[model samples]
Target: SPSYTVLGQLPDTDVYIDIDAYEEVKEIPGIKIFQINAPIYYANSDLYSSANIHTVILDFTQVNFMDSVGVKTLAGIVKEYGDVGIYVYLAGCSAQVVNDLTSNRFFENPALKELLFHSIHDAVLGSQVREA
Candidate 1:
């Protein structure tokens, strides 16, 4: 199952996020992909952090909604990874979530231009090519 069992609870809500944390989990070349299937929020932000992984891909298509804190938390994580020369990509994001993240400055860095993608297929391929 490749379960990390990272725990989390959404804010001002009782919806617990503990199942199907990811799908198609794997590593490609220098990248690690976590296909997150639920809406990401404060409770699970730390769980997504990578202390030693070379790169990471976060899939957000299944995520129907995202609060500001989730975007900020993810941005902070991406920033931390970037600080250490690690890469982070966001793939398969829904239109609404993408608008939320971009409008709020989560994907502001030009360096992250390649971070968001329309499809998971391209996300993996892009990361492989960029790092190859």
Candidate 2:
């Protein structure tokens, strides 16, 4: 019963993206992970068009699947926006997801090498906290 919701708002030079994919009704463990990635990719295209944006916050609170494609997509975003001081903040990632990122050198891309990995509160506060 988990659902994916993608919201994109453009306010002047800033683009705000909120992706909510929480299954409120389902007790199933891994039924809704893949359903959200495509929309996330689609939304990325829109985010890529904005020239004034300096920050990208990715909320992964409900993400149950962190596959290779997802990791690659994140790398692509960091690479694409490397020149603009684009800071990416990843929040609410599951333990498995975090492990995947760390193990795969997802944080090794030069563009994302200094990217911040934060918990929900730290991310919301716009802090530059990296994972160990």
Candidate 3:
């Protein structure tokens, strides 16, 4: 599995939470930031679900490539999160990466399409703005 990082941020401020370094994983009240360190492949598509969060930001900035299987897995993951009332926002996706997702029907679900963001910061702001 590819290594990943998870951080948390309070959308109203600059506060950041290092989720991985915490002694015990708990529900982070703010939006969670998740990023994979390598290209997304079939073997690395697995991800963990956070405790109790309404929004999550998937930082795809580091992912330069994604395979077909990876796309399917990612779509499933996103849908699963949505089913549980958690919104997964994809951030910093390259044109090619977006194409891959599109071709795989990842955005066919209206709930998933609007969740795309241009950057992690934008997604953070979006999560808060959507609350109003």
Candidate 4:
């Protein structure tokens, strides 16, 4: 279910998956960087609803498309995380993706602002490492 590229000196966690699906996860310090390469849609919306996603960083750099349903689900995720004091980062989002995220009905919520980040490094910097 994944295509991988490994760095000889790094641990297995450093493996990066390159397929256009839900791929590899890279753990650095306290951050769990989940690479969801697929476009977020209803079929995959449940993936983000996990209680274990408490403080994970989402890599959206590979995601180039989204629809109103997905946008709404993302907005809900932001709110859900906020409600429970969990953290979610929408990292590496392209310009259009950001626009799509912001154009939704729930986008105006203040917590939605916290979900957007320029990079995984930035998001991880803002978050703390916790047991996953």
Candidate 5:
């Protein structure tokens, strides 16, 4: 089975899902950006269905390449979930990925802003359930 990684917790606030490196393909010349998006969406759906998980932390440190498709997929996830107050944290993104996300105004989506961005360590430490 294809596998992914999860690291740390956000106290009462959220859960972190780290999609690990793409499975090595011998002939591929560039990154498998789509694979990354798929696992994230799959994991998010699984967690949302099985648990009360509301916030998701996506760690992109291991990713070396990403393009419009990957960015759109991520934006779609945020859009779909954010409607119900579910948030996503984009953490540890590479500069390249970050540029795409920010430049494309993915963060501008009102729902997406609730999906925060931060360094991995900061997200792990800072995220918490919004006080009632």
Candidate 6:
């Protein structure tokens, strides 16, 4: 089961817009701003296979802590999605999470640094800018 929750955004806005996961997955296009509830200690198989997904933003607004496995899993998520051409971004991460990832050398790759944002809204704007 997924320890994280996914949400869609209204085009050009920070407001969250979503439908049922099954229906929205098929109807939405381009980007998705996922608000996870856990420390990213788990994964969702269907999410990795979803279509019309250009970029995936992991929102850490609800997450305050992440252990080593959490850091590793997030790294794996970025690697896995990047391999298939879907980009991954991190948003709303607290200082603690940032410190943890940084201590683990997660930001060794310069590219990953470009993906961190202050909020999901910022990430959404950045993603659209990248698309343009």
Candidate number that wins on TM-score, 2 or 5: 5
Q: lDDT (0-100) at residue 121 of candidate 6? A: 72
Runs off by more than 4 Å, candidate 1 = 1-29, 42-52
lDDT of 3 by residue, 1-132 (tens): 346677655444544444655545433466667776665542244454322577878888778767778888777777788788788888889999888888877877766678888877778778875642
Steric clash pairs (candidate 1): none
Clashes of 5: 1
lDDT of each: 0.62, 0.51, 0.70, 0.59, 0.53, 0.73
Q: Candidate 2's residue-wise lDDT over 7-126, tens digit each?
A: 333333222344242323221121111123443555455455553444555657667656676678777766675555555666667778777777767966455534454444444345
In terms of TM-score, the best-performing candidate is 6
Q: In model 6, which regions exceed 4 Å deviation? A: 10-12, 17-28, 44-51
**Residue-by-residue lDDT tens digits, candidate 6, 39-132:** 4654444456562778888878878877887788788889988888888988888999889899988998977888898987777678776642
Error of 1 at 116 (Å): 0.7
| Cα TM-score of candidate 3 | 0.72
Model 1 weakest 10-residue run by lDDT:
1-10
TM-score of each: 0.66, 0.54, 0.72, 0.65, 0.57, 0.77
**Model 1: per-residue lDDT, tens digit, 1-132?**
232232222333323233344343323455556656455553254465542556676766567767787788788778888888787787778889878888778767766667887765566557655553
User: Which regions in candidate 4 have their CA more than 4 angstroms from the true location?
Assistant: 1-26, 42-54, 128-132
Clashing pairs in 5: 13-129
Clashing pairs in 6: none
Candidate ranking under lDDT, highest first, comes to 6, 3, 1, 4, 5, 2
Evaluate residue 72 in candidate 2 and report its C-alpha lDDT on the 0 to 100 scale. Answer: 80
**Per-residue lDDT of 37-69 in model 5, one digit per residue for the tens?**
344455445546755555555667666655666
